[PDB]
Design a protein around this ligand. Sequence first.
Ligand SMILES: *[C@@H]1O[C@H](CO)[C@@H](O[C@@H]2O[C@H](CO)[C@@H](O)[C@H](O)[C@H]2NC(C)=O)[C@H](O)[C@H]1NC(C)=O
Ligand code: NAG
Lengths: 121, 121, 121, 327, 327, 327, 327, 324
Amino acid sequence: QVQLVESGGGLVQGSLRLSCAASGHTFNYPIMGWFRQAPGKEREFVGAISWSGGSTSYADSVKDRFTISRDNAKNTVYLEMNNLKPEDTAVYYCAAKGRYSGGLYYPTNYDYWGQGTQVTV
Amino acid sequence: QVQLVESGGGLVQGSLRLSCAASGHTFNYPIMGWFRQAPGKEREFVGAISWSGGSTSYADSVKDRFTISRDNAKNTVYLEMNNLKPEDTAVYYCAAKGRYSGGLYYPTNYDYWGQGTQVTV
Amino acid sequence: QVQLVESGGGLVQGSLRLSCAASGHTFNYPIMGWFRQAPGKEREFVGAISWSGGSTSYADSVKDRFTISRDNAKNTVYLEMNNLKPEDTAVYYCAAKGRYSGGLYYPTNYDYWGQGTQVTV
Amino acid sequence: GNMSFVKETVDKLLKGYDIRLRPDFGGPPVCVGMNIDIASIDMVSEVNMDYTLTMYFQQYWRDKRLAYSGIPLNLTLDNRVADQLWVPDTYFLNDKKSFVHGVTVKNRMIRLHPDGTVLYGLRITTTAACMMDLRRYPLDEQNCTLEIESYGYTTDDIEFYWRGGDKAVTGVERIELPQFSIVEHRLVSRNVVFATGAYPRLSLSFRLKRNIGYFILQTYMPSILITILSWVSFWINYDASAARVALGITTVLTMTTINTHLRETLPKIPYVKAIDMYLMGCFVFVFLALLEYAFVNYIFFAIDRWSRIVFPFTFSLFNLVYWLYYV
Amino acid sequence: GNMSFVKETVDKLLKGYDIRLRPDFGGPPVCVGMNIDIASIDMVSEVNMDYTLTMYFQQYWRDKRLAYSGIPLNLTLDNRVADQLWVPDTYFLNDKKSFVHGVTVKNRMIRLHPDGTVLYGLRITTTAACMMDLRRYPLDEQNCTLEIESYGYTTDDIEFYWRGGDKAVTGVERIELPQFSIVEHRLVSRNVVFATGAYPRLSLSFRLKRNIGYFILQTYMPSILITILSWVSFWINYDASAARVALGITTVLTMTTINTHLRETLPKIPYVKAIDMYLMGCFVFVFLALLEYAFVNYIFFAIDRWSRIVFPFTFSLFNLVYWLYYV
Amino acid sequence: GNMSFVKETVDKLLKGYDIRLRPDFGGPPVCVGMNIDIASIDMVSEVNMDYTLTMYFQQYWRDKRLAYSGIPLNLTLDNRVADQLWVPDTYFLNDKKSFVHGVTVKNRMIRLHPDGTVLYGLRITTTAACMMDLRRYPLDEQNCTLEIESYGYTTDDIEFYWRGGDKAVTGVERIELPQFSIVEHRLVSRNVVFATGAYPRLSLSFRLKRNIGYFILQTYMPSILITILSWVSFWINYDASAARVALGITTVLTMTTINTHLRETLPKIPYVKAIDMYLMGCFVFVFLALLEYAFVNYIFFAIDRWSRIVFPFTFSLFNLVYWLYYV
Amino acid sequence: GNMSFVKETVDKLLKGYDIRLRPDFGGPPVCVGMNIDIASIDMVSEVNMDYTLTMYFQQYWRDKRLAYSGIPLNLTLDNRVADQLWVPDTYFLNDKKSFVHGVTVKNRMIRLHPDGTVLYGLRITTTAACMMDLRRYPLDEQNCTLEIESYGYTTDDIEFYWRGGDKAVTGVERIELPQFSIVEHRLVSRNVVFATGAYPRLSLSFRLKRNIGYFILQTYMPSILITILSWVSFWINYDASAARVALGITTVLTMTTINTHLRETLPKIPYVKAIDMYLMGCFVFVFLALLEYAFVNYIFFAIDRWSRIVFPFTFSLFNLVYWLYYV
Amino acid sequence: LPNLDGLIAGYARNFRPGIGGPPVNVALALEVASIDHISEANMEYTMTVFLHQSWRDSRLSYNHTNETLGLDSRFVDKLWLPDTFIVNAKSAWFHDVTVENKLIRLQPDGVILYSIRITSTVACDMDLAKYPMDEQECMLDLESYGYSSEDIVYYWSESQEHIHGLDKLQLAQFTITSYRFTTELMNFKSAGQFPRLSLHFHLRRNRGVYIIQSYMPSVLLVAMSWVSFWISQAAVPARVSLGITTVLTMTTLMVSARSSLPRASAIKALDVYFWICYVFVFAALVEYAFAHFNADADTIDIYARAVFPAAFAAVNVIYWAAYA
Ligand SMILES: *[C@@H]1O[C@H](CO)[C@@H](O[C@@H]2O[C@H](CO)[C@@H](O)[C@H](O)[C@H]2NC(C)=O)[C@H](O)[C@H]1NC(C)=O
Ligand SMILES: *[C@@H]1O[C@H](CO)[C@@H](O)[C@H](O)[C@H]1NC(C)=O
């Protein structure tokens, strides 16, 4: 049982920093992922990071532009979106994955999801 | 990442002592080799030695004439060329080899190379 | 490298005690053997003993008549020949055998040999 | 109900098939694509200088002898069919002991394709040797590699490449080492020349950074506390010979026990580790503290106040230099 | 005397049978029902973060190729007939080392049915990895899972379900762990997607609650006794410098030995456990007690009475806060 | 597209081939050339008197039954073809436990030649016994051998030789032993006679020199420090009976613990090692120091100054003699 | 070039050969001659009461079905031919775990003879149980046996004899046990009757004498030194209460640690060993020494001189009686 | 030879004798060779046994021959065999040196004698409440894995009471007091009734120098603490040192004993004795502290000299009588 709350969206024309706070049995779900869903398009994987060790992965589209890091003190995973593009207009979600739930890039492997923040540039 | 600098060549008619200084991640490359390349001829293996243990190997042509030893304090591998012959006229190189890079006698197994010193007798 | 010197032969009509002194890398050769060679006949195994443990073996001809024992302080293996017979007229040799050199009874398995003492009764 | 048709198709493929011959034997080398899905890294052993790795090892290659037509599907066959098919002689050069899981059946996958492409997957638990530089231990950084090579076929007969480029190896985030963290992983493709010939080499390397949290509590903190414990003798009056001498002895003896215990958990390396330097420095302070009282006792039959300000200051200076050098 | 008739029936079933092809190959996926009869949980290891499980693994699926008529009985065949029959490629994803018992024969059961249903049972001893959160150790609660998945066949070819619903797994009451108690077990059925495709997943999870009885006697009680032992120095006269100093040293040294011994029985985790916090707190009290006499000795060359009431009261307050927080 | 032609050629070679008969059966002995490529020496164990060796074992011999014409290439066949070919019955005489790696396939290579020459390679991890002389331990030098011999065929049927002379064994520089250094390696070819007959023997021997760096820090340094610690009692006044007696007891007890710990890490040999002699000498000095105060206490109810100059001088003389003798 | 003729001869021998039937089935029993070439005795374990033995096990018997004519040679065949030949069901009755070496091939030899005689050799590493009488430990003498018996065939079908009489077992001098010496070995041939029938038995027994050199240094010397250490308190003045009491405590505590350490290296036997008696005697002397000062302290609030002559004299008398009894 | 070929040719290996009929009656016998290890930490014991199984298979009956056909282990793979397995075996394996230690003897009437030598590590649930003065009972359950009572029925052979060999066994730490062969015909695990043959043998731990080792340092530490009573009260460092050393050594002994034993949360009798000894040594140090505080008294020492030896003797009598 993990609860995910994300905030820090809004509308800009730039650098933006999303955040996602987790609470509950975070030990059983050590992997946090970021997903965005364009209108009509299928939900797209953005990046994933582990709670322990800070190992991270990114998609090719957001590679070298988005940075993901977390702090275990606040149980918060934050996505830093820099050098925004008009293609980056989608609802950003926060998800958690089980230890033996498979690959990172597939949203169906994640059990708990956040509300979702709409970002338009 | 290992940087190799060699010196101590020149022209003689005798005993000569080459040297080779190493710097960087020398632990990942515990084997140092010596190579010479005659004009037109392919590069020839001379001798190899390990950083730890002092185990050394030599070619038949330079056997019982060239001695190779190293000192870990200066990270230097030196080749002592005694009883020189006119056949020993080539550019002497210094190389480093990985732990699982294969045989000593093949220059293609070595990753980092020095500038090379020309010796003519 | 083991050096073997034997002494204590001579001519008698009785009880005689041969001896054999060893020096060098005796650890690599823990087994000492005694051999005799009659004129024209092939060299014959007499008895063998280990440096450590005192385990000994004898041939049927010399069984219950010859006793073999050693002292590690002097690195000496001595053969005590009692109740001599006219058949016991041969040159007695002292030999050492390697750890993995095979059977005791075969002289070709021994690496280092002594000079040999001639005994005639 | 085309199972009979599929059975006839597969029997036709294996009729006359020679497992002794590689695909395109005597011609161009067969390209083998390799991907690794890391399951976990169970253990990292400094004493044995090796690590245990569990992974899904997939091999991709095309064999035109297995090409089939009329079936627009990928034939996922039983794992026992791999015994009648040619497979690359892939082995791990630096492994020490490896096996393939066989419960409830052998952890093996065969998936044919209409064009002749063969997918071969294995779940392998391997113990691969990894030489470690413990000079900066426990603040050291280690680089452990996994060498992949063909045993019999040279570069003229077989070629290796990472299928998918830098995305060939996945599951790195699944690695949960209590003592290490995966800083980075790299994929290397190269050729290695032996006497028998030149062979294709694939290398997978991880850079491991050791966690200092365990060693601070286990070793560094007790050493500091013993050193602080020896400073108590300075405030004790010099006439209390039994008390101050006992304080000096116990701190020195305790320091030796800590030093001996640490060296028993590590390989017998000849060089001095970073932790050894700290323990040697701590032993000097406690030994000097006992020698300090011996000097005080000797002169008696001001010095204590001077010792109360030098030892904590020198130890703090020693700690500052030690941590700056190794960080 | 219809053994010949049964032999003819079985030979007819295996004539033309292709083990390389799953039932209904190229059509609907074959549903495999699974039930587990747990025999015992031999070991639960914190250092290796794994547990050893022995169980009877039964698989239930229908193969119309094995359907027979005229025999109103369930054919219980020899276990060696399983080599000529297709079986699911079921494997355990999180296992570290598993095997099938083979004394006096392989612990395997094949039971055919007239409609083609096949019952396949195996007695498997498996060592499955289980990551443990030791922050609240030894008052922690652990959740160890057993992942069941098909290796080669995707969801388009095979499906997994717990036969009998929540009653699929039995024998949970047979588990007798001296250190743990089975609070609850759960059955989870889901689909896991990899690069090769989506695969059916069955998960069996146990929630383990550690027993505090062993750790109270082994660790908590000796730590309290040493802390009480240090309080004896308060009642000793200040002129007895050797006696009071010796009492402070021994309690401090004994506390360190207890702390070192505990950390050697657990994996080298970087974070601080609950038991570590208690040991650190106990070390502070004994260290302050020795520092208390040093202050008394320094001023001399009332304080003891004040120490007699503060230390037992503060330690009792520390114990009350510690136990309330972790219970 | 001559795969069919190659398949016909290989099938012709294996048609009528008898694995039970060696090449040139009943005639001249078959000469087998052997090369070893050392991968690593994982462990050297004094307690078990053995070492673990991983190597590539290549065997070269000519079999005219496998000669083929019309193919100007070296046929690199699958490793599974070795089961249909005669191979030498080569075994290691002094090995204790050996195996051939089998991931992802058996680490085996078969390479035929047009003239009938067969190349047979195996990656073998072997544990070979090595008796060690620990009289000069830890300043000792060890000679560990690897005996290679044919099990069934005598010298009349098979012959062994090092292919390439002194260059047959390579990879010696790859050996990285933390405790030992490879001074030299030798190749020996000889014949060994048993009751069954005379057999060809190949011997590979390494001379290992132990590194003193670990033992200086682990054993020699603590022993010296304890001996120096006992000298502190000389500067303590004789009236401090509790302090000086405690110093003598602790040094003696600590010396015993060091001696017991060392002997538990080594095989139970009856003879005295070099390190044992040093520990016995150190124990004498600390024991005499405690006896020295007993003499001082007895006469009291100048001597201390005499002890301050004799003990450090005698200990320095003892160290000088000890190191010169064993170096 | 008579390889074809030899191949025809061998194929004729194996044509119609039935491995299920022993030679001369239904007639006289087949006599099997056995020789053993001992390679080494790796370990002798008191805790497990077993020893590890590596040897060459040769079996000699005549099978007229394998007799061949026209070839005046001894056919040394490949070891894989043993699977098509009948071999005795020889097993070791007292073994705990045994295996046959298989690198680079199975360590097996088959050598046929023109008259039908078959030589069958195996290199076997076996762990055989050996019950040990530790009453006189470590001055004990042990008799470890190796029982050789046929499993299925009774004396009516098979007979065992030592080929060569007392010279059947060789290589006894090769045994190099650091802790034991081979005093004597014996060969025993007898018949053992079970419910299934009477079976032939061959027994090979070694008498092992333990070396006292290790135990003198490890156990006896430290015990004597502690006892001598307790005697120092006699020469210390009675007013030094802290010094003499500390001497008594440390010697008693050290004696207990030595006793506990020794018993942890040996099986938990109920009877008292010889070494235990010596340790118990040493504990009495040190305990009485501490009780001696308590008597002196009690009367004070001549005796010491009386203790200085009784304790060394009684301890010397105790040592003299102890060594004479056990030697 | 022709008889053996004929029997194999018409043999259907995958089916039990009389399939679809009366269950096969399998006679079972055990010849225990040794019991190597008995680990309380691992709750297991290792046993090597000769397992004899006898049943009648009419498909293998032959004609004109009255002599039993003694066959080797190579013939085993051709015939049908009972799927007998050890229910509570952690691990087991066959001895195959120099060959597979299997025996098949075939009789003309069709009776098959099947003997194998197997070593098995068998889990034994042990109660350590009275450790080390505890008596343990260990079982050896034998059962058909796949054939229910409708197919295979097990029963101990008449020769079981004569060939068990449990009397001849010698155990280093235990003693086999009693043994029993039990048949349980009402055992159902998952589907169908599986008859179970169980061998129960009782092990009594030897009470000798082994229990002496653990209990004497406990007693000797208590005796050492009593020595402080006869020491003068003015010798503060001496009596304090004697008190602390006994208390600390007792603490380490409790820590070492439990650590060197199974991690089970069991209050063993040895642990109770350690607690009693720790109370006495702690009380002795408290006694001196009270005497020292009152001094800031010789009657208290005299009374302590009487009570502590008397109380410790009394509590030992209560302790030893209860557990023994
Ligand atoms: C084949 O083996 C047999 C048996 O070992 C050999 O016969 C022995 O020959 C030796 C002399 O070499 C005699 O001392 C033995 O008495 C013989 N034993 C028997 C049973 O005959 C035979 O010589 C061998 N043949 C060859 C060609 O080596
Ligand atoms: C033996 O052989 C005869 C041959 O005719 C056959 O009829 C018979 O059934 C066989 N078995 C018995 C038990 O007679």
